[PDB]
Amino acid sequence: AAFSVAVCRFSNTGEDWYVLVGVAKDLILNPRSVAGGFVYTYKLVNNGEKLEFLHKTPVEEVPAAIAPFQGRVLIGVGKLLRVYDLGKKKLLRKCENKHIANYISGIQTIGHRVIVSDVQESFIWVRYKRNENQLIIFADDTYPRWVTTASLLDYDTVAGADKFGNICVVRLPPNTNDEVDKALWDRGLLNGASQKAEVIMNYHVGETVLSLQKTTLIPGGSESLVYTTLSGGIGILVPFTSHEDHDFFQHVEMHLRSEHPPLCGRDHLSFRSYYFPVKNVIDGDLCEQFNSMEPNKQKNVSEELDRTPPEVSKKLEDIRTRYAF
Amino acid sequence: AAAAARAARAAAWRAEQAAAA
Amino acid sequence: MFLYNLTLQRATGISFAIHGNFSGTKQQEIVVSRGKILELLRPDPNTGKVHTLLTVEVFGVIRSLMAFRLTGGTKDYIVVGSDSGRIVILEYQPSKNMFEKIHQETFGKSGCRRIVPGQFLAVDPKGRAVMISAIEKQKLVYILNRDAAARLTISSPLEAHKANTLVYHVVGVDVGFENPMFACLEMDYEEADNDPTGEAAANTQQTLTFYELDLGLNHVVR
Amino acid sequence: WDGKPIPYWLYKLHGLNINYNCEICGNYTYRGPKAFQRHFAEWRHAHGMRCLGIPNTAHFANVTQIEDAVSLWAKLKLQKASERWQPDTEEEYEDSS
Amino acid sequence: IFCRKQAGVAIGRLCEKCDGKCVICDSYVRPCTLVRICDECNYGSYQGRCVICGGPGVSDAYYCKECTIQEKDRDGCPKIV
């Protein structure tokens, strides 16, 4: 059963693109009892048009996350984070860390930092040094999140999803010493690393997100975080470029929470604060119901904003058109 | 005392409210 | 860092689907639940196509969906059981192309809880009464009638509760013009909770339960 | 009981009627539970752990027996050597294609 | 001290002494959601009476904004017995 796939180059090998496929062997889901694991390697011959079976490296757990890393590859074998290098007949385990809590489901990489997603715990930051071959965990986040997938925004900020239908965005605080290095005397803050990652965004979509990407759908616009959901929906998250636009859309969302309640009687604020509270987002699914609301209610909402309902609709369309549609 | 400067404080508050608006 | 959420394409999977005269005309329409989005669709009898008349983001998990028609009426209302803890009766207005909250009865806390109802929903085929029900312990019956102005009146909820009981599926019974009867599949897990041998789980058989509701006597009898 | 005799309610309140024996401290007897948990970071238990070749971390608090202390040290050193990544990497142990 | 039965269609009321008060937390700040009470507490001679004292009701009883935020409006009939 294939569960992970990646394409990468290597330092010991030339410009060949290697396809590494992680496969669980005879995995029974309920109850969980895996009989081992394999990582197939293919050389991707005939210019990206054919796979040739080169070798198959057996591993003990499910290699659930494969990611290229500085000319080598990172494989998450259960709770083990292994820096592998490509060998002749097998894959050579060059480094290993085993302070991951339960089970690795995703590995991200930007610069030297490696962001690892646990099946139940949050993102774990690993500082890898090319010297001494060490995977040093230096940060984590203090929430149990059943993370489906993750994404990278810059060197310090990581977005991610949940198995329950949430999207969180966490960020390392400034002036964290990334050059950390006995283990018996030294202890973390709470059963983890000595440094913790603060959450700067949390938002319940209501439908489980399995893919996030920081892209730009239309040319000439600006970058935005696109998510796709298991119920068939595609949404986006748009950063606010000014304080006044954020204040205006905050007031619009506050007015549409009260004067336009949701149809099922659910509180919109409590729906967006389902598992974790809403933070630093404005739900434009409710704000785009301003145009479908009654016109007397439209001017009744818009009179506190000191704007005409055409002007509110113009700002609502401008935040949708100045970013991706 | 404060009673002599009460009108000045009220005028300063009105000026601040005019400048804030 | 402050963000703004948008939906480029709404959810397209269908959890529940019911049919009826929601527009009040002779043609039949489909109400589908896309999870947190309720949609009204019109299957065209001539070209055979499907037109999505209305999409409304309800901002909550629609755990059940069933339509009922009153006796002699020509319009179908939508009974929505959600994670809000409230039972919501809606009517489609074709003039304004929106759903009007005809009734919103609050009975429990919000969320997909084990005993707050909303998961299971049943109607009487004559439209006299509906029964919302949870997985466990808790069934509520709302008797529905009309005033002289042809509106909808919902009664106070009649408790048909039974502790330590799992509900598999509830549905109404077409008894005719007699007392409205609701059919449940039930499991009695109390004997298997206190049996460490595990033999009780191997012998806990299901029960088909007929709850009769006497409208004049205004109570629910097993 | 320091200098003048302490009051008997002070004797019963501190717990000095209950005595705990530590084999690592040379079968030392400590009166009162608060002093008993106080001695584990003190110099006597540190020297007793030095005589046993045990670094006396917080894992060995509330440990009195010698055999229990060395069994805990063996298990802790085993799981610490397992958790630490010793340089046991493989570098082409099957030199063929 | 609370009835806590399953509320129905009956609307809770307040007397002239407690007009505007929240029946759960006693706060006078920001009423939010209309109070519903059980049918037994509104049956017969009890209709329209104050949900705190049982005296004559002159206004509709409300849960405060803080109580509805904490979903303290979903706990049952708040008539004090």
Next chain:
Amino acid sequence: SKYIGTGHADTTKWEWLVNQHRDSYCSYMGHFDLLNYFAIAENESKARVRFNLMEKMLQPCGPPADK
């Protein structure tokens, strides 16, 4: 106290986790996308998944312990 799933100072591990598992199963059957996820993992219909979770509601953690 009358709400099923709450506890007290004498709550046993078995009862607490049985409550957790039953709450979780009801939550899966409520949250459409959780059940969707579970129905994609195995190759079973949603109705079959609902049936399996309902059969698991009787004894989700197995028989209890003595004393």
Next chain:
Amino acid sequence: NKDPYFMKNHLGSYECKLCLTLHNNEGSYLAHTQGKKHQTNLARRAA
């Protein structure tokens, strides 16, 4: 008084640092001074 043990805290009461005690007024502190605790604490501080 002029003793260093008597002080006025941040809470309006009076506190004796020698005995680690709180007193509502001056009379309670002077009754505490004649008590066994203050005499024994002064005898401990006498050495």
Next chain:
Amino acid sequence: DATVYVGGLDEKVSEPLLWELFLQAGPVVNTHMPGYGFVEFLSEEDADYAIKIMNMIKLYGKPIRVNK
């Protein structure tokens, strides 16, 4: 001994002052003011280096006799 006892330091020298004085040789994990003082560092070699370094530090005429 990972904690070094510094004798010869009077009570006029503050515990944050002692922590800052021993902070240059290494990060003081813990401090205690008993007359004398105690400073526990992260590593024993760091404590030995601090004891060898600050022994000649006659702060206001008071040497910091730091011993393991």
Next chain:
Amino acid sequence: NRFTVAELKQLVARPDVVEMHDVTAQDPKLLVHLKATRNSVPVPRHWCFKRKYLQGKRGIEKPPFELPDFIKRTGIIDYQKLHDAFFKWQTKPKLTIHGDLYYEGKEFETRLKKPGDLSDELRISLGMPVGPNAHKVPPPWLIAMQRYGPPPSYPNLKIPGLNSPIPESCSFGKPLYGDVF
């Protein structure tokens, strides 16, 4: 039926969090497993005390109240100054992580505490003037840090005379995504 604390430390995989009383619970294995859960902040210590968690904080006098510096800069008649204090100089105070509770000696503990340079009052108490000199502004402990090499606990700090030049020692030694503007 109850096993010893050493036996409980042997059976569980986390013997660090086992205390003396943890064997007396109804389920000790579940207790130590829940104490081994990651982000669970410790239970307050005064469950085992007998002094109601703050009745011992009596003799240590404290300042009555400290003010934040932006409000204190207003001299607390111009309300625009107060608007600037609450909206242009309102710095965030030093908060805490969720795993850091409070106890009796937390206020008087000074773990919050810059290697290679002591304070001005610390240098005055050490008989050292404050300045950019390399003859007296380094401490006398830095003389051994030149003679015996740099300390291993501060590898990024360059000692003057050992790892830093004498005239160069003036103190005796990615863009964010989604931000506004």
Next chain:
Amino acid sequence: LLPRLTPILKNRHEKVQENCIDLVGRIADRGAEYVSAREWMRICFELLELLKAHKKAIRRATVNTFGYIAKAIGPHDVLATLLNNLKVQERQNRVCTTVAIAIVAETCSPFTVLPALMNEYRVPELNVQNGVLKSLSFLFEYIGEMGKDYIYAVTPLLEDALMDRDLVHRQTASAVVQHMSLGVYGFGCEDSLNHLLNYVWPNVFETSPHVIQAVMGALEGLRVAIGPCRMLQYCLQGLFHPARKVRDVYWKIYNSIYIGSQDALIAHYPRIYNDDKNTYIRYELDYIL
């Protein structure tokens, strides 16, 4: 016109009271130019007592009119009078004064009230500090969402009060924390409330009923504002603590969290491993596509 209206405020009939208060309020709203500050202070002094009326219409009119006067005139003098009243009353109308301070904060800007209010807090008479704390509690409950820009500003005082020796301070500070957390719910103040949660939590073993009641109310407000996951994280160690008292307290808190947040806790329960007899792993949540 207005000095003629001044003696009519002491009339006992509710209709005259309501109408005259509304008239004075509209005068203060759009025509306060032609009236000196001293007459408005006299009106405020007469108006303060009418905040505790039984009829909600007069209280609402009184709130509106006091707000209009506070908006019209400067904050400083009326605030000084109110703080003076706060210190010299120690009686039932102190809460009246408290309501008036909150009205000033909601109608005018709160940065005109918090500096002077907190500088008066440094006096060591204690009863004045309890008054400041009660004023802050009602102020935050009354202004609601507007308090989101003032959490940091009052965080040090709350740190001081939550660790003070006096237990009345702890109870009122917990009330401030509850009203704060419920007022800023969903506006990103999680870290400041987490910090204040670390000072609110150790008081869960307090025996006084009004205090442990205020602590549980603060915990419920914090469950709403920070989320049930953090509260559950604080809860899990003592749920099976050896001490029965600890188990009673922590199971009470768990019951409150569970009743308020039953469906959310599914995502927040810790991983409990299987044993030799029972299955405790929720395997479905361990599925990875």
Next chain:
RNA sequence: UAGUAUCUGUUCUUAUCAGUUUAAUAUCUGAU
């Protein structure tokens, strides 16, 4: 009015086990 808090006073063999209970003491019940 009757509730809480703070001072003063008292606070129970440096003689041994078992049982109830307690997180452990303490308390209570029997034997030496």
Next chain:
RNA sequence: GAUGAUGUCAUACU
């Protein structure tokens, strides 16, 4: 460095 428990005290706040 471990200050608890009780009443005839006496003194303060609700």
